[PDB]
Design a protein around this ligand. Structure first.
Ligand SMILES: C[C@@H]1O/C(=N\OC(=O)Nc2ccccc2)[C@@H](O)[C@H](O)[C@@H]1O
Ligand SMILES: C[C@@H]1O/C(=N\OC(=O)Nc2ccccc2)[C@@H](O)[C@H](O)[C@@H]1O
Lengths: 438, 437
């Protein structure tokens, strides 16, 4: 099908900027906005829904919601501390909410009064974060919500002549903010779009293709996520020729691809994001309301992503005062101790092409290292490895100690790899040397 | 498709005899015959192939092979010590080679001279084992090879009038031995046929249906394996309508059914068999030539079978002297030590209807117990349980202790059934209380 506004990449991008986005592998997400103030409570009622949607849950008028700017004073905010927290965690990039659905900008936009500038704190939070993260060697990605609850020219659908004209004004406004972010903060490496699912955006595929090109023209090598993009026909993420639009698929949140049934995902770049609670992105005061993931449950999902050729981003919702809740400091600390030991099987790794086994995941390094990441320790003391046609295992090594690991052939294309003599007592890595028959 | 010699069961038999066959779940195989004497070596060459096929590997003439009878003298043999070893192991049934391809009979058959009777030992080994196993409360099943290298009336195909005349004589001989086993040893619970794959048997489907019928008449509630059976069109195991013949499917000697892709096996009774080495059933003197399974690799396979509504039989190949090699005594000892702790999860258990998880297998007790048989201990300290649509986990208990196990709900239809407060330190069992509505 001829499309003017469909996909622009033939397979994965291999330019250095995309290779860096991919090699980074582990990200953090920051959700910070006016929603951190009520933290899921409005007018004495606590709402179970995602805190950053509280304006919706509590049916708050825009005027009353955005009045929260008068209370915005994150006195314990310290962009250097935040960047050290991310660096200690082992995050290679941070994705920041520049503007959520609420419409409150974390940078002093000249296109709205609903920004950091018009609060008691006054400071350009986005700018302080970009510089602090960048000083730590950490890449910065901008989340941006097209849907904007603060602009009455937004429309969910086009059902009239006045909807058409208002939505045209809305797209001009959106272009102004996007160009302003690209120009103010040229170290930006990615635009992660949200609030682009409505019938209104679907009917403006041309506009989604325009925003992608506009930002690519302003920011050499910038990445753009698939959630932005609709084609000529208003088909999202993948065009009507089934090709991926944008630079990477960003449709995975809180259910990762099946390691046996979804090997299709290894054909394109992709990024999963995840919450620590079941479904809280912004600060919610009461994490007793849903299940809260442990560090290992989070590390399992990071390795799972990389094992299938994808990035993983772990969300944080900072407190209204500018500090991180205890649960989130414990998470970043725990992930960071594990990444310092075992990160060689995450950073710059990818799909290995081996059949999934029960003990954990395989990942593949740039020089054909095959890492076994063991999450489930067999009582048998043998890790089953089934090799693809023509692949043999020549050696196994415990990554953290360098100790040689016994490898025994059990049948054609199957080995037992021995567990370490001493139980590592957490998820661990055995590095395989393998050979391809010519 | 209209069939006279297709399936005789509609779904699973549920008479007490089949319920016993199924509840037993854990079997032992015994491969014992003349092949135990050479143990895979013939004229100074050790053959790497299955030792019970040595006659075929070394191309031994029947006359020369069957002369091994002259050396058959297992003076270390004691059926009571065999029946005790099987009892310690937690085996509920024993499948015994009455006659393997070589055609040497472990019972004094009237229809051939190639029997224990015509050896120095003289004694009815089969009858001795039947009594010893039965007195320890162990069911006894008869392996029987229709293909018989001792009888020149055997044919692989029927391509001449002489082929027809000879094979007809061979089927008469086969019926005689089958009738003789069923009458001499009426405690027999099952006949597990082998040597039935040749065009000669496939083209005589009527006969396979006759041997099943004849044995079911002589032995009330006897089981008959799928391997015997060919229908009217020569379709084996499953008839041309896709319906299982005999009382259970006998396969998965190479690989067990896949826990995700082959849930279809839960629809019929089935039994897997396995070797401890990669492919040795009869005694082979050199177990260094292939990989030898550890006890936990064997218990993994047993639990896998029951988790998919199947039986598992672990093979033993006794030495020519009538004793068992050190590796087989260690295996039997270890399987029993584990089965005494955790056997509630195996005996009289079946498919649980739960989505397979990485840490191990579900089995279902007769009263809706759900056992998590944990082989792969998560560092997370959380065992993921996705329940089917309309099931909840009310509690969890370390089977060996009484100790209660924290269940946490995580999403709709998912839990972190906690691991036991203390790590059972081997494949272990946590028991779940479920509830539907
Ligand atoms: C990154 C997160 O994502 C969102 N929305 O994304 C989706 O709705 N994703 C989605 C929905 C259905 C299927 C797949 C993805 C936001 O509304 C949320 O507040 C947060 O910023
Ligand atoms: C029980 C064992 O089984 C045999 N044959 O069985 C099979 O080959 N079984 C099989 C093969 C393919 C698919 C399913 C079952 C015999 O030749 C062997 O000596 C041993 O007695």
């Amino acid at each position: 099908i001829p499309l003017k506004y469909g996909a622009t990449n033939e397979g994965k991008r291999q330019d250095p900027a995309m290779q860096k986005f991919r090699d980074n592998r582990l990200g953090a997400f920051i959700h910070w906005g006016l929603y951190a103030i009520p933290g899921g409570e409005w007018n004495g009622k606590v709402y179970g829904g995602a805190a950053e949607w509280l304006k919706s849950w509590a049916k708050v008028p825009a005027d009353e919601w955005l009045k929260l700017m008068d209370q915005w004073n994150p006195t314990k905010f310290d962009a250097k501390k935040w960047a050290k927290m991310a660096k200690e965690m082992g995050t290679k990039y941070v994705k920041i909410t520049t503007k959520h659905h609420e419409g409150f900008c974390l940078w002093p936009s000249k296109y709205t009064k609903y920004t950091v500038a018009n609060t008691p704190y006054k400071r350009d939070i986005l700018g302080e974060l970009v510089k602090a993260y960048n000083d730590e060697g950490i890449d910065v990605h901008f989340y941006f919500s097209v849907m904007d609850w603060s602009n009455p020219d937004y429309r969910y659908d086009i059902k009239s002549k006045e909807d058409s004209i208002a939505f045209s004004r809305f797209l001009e406004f959106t272009d102004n903010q996007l160009k302003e972010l690209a120009t103010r903060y040229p170290t930006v490496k990615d635009f992660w779009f949200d609030g682009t699912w409505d019938a209104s955006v679907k009917k403006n595929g041309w506009w989604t293709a325009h925003a992608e090109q506009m930002l690519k023209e302003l920011v050499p090598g910038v990445a753009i996520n698939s959630r932005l993009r609709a084609d000529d026909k208003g088909k999202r993420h993948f065009d009507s020729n089934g090709r991926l639009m944008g630079d990477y698929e960003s449709g995975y949140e809180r259910r990762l691809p099946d390691p046996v049934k979804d090997l299709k995902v290894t054909q394109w770049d992709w990024e999963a994001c995840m919450t620590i609670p079941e479904n809280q992105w912004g600060y919610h005061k009461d994490w007793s309301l849903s299940y809260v993931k442990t560090p290992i449950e989070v590390i399992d999902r990071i390795v799972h992503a990389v094992s299938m050729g994808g990035n993983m981003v772990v969300n944080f919702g900072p407190q209204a005062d500018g500090d991180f809740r205890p649960e989130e400091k414990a998470m970043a600390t725990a992930i960071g101790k594990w990444m310092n030991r075992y990160g060689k099987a995450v950073y710059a790794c990818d799909y290995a092409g081996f059949e999934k086994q029960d003990w954990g995941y395989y990942t593949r390094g740039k020089n054909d290292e095959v890492y076994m990441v063991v999450f489930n320790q067999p009582y048998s003391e043998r890790l089953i490895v089934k090799t693809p046609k023509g692949i043999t295992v020549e050696k196994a090594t415990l990554l953290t100690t360098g100790e040689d690991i016994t490898v025994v052939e059990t049948t054609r294309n199957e080995y037992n790899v021995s567990v370490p003599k001493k139980n590592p007592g957490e998820p661990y890595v055995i590095q395989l040397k393998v050979r391809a028959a010519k």
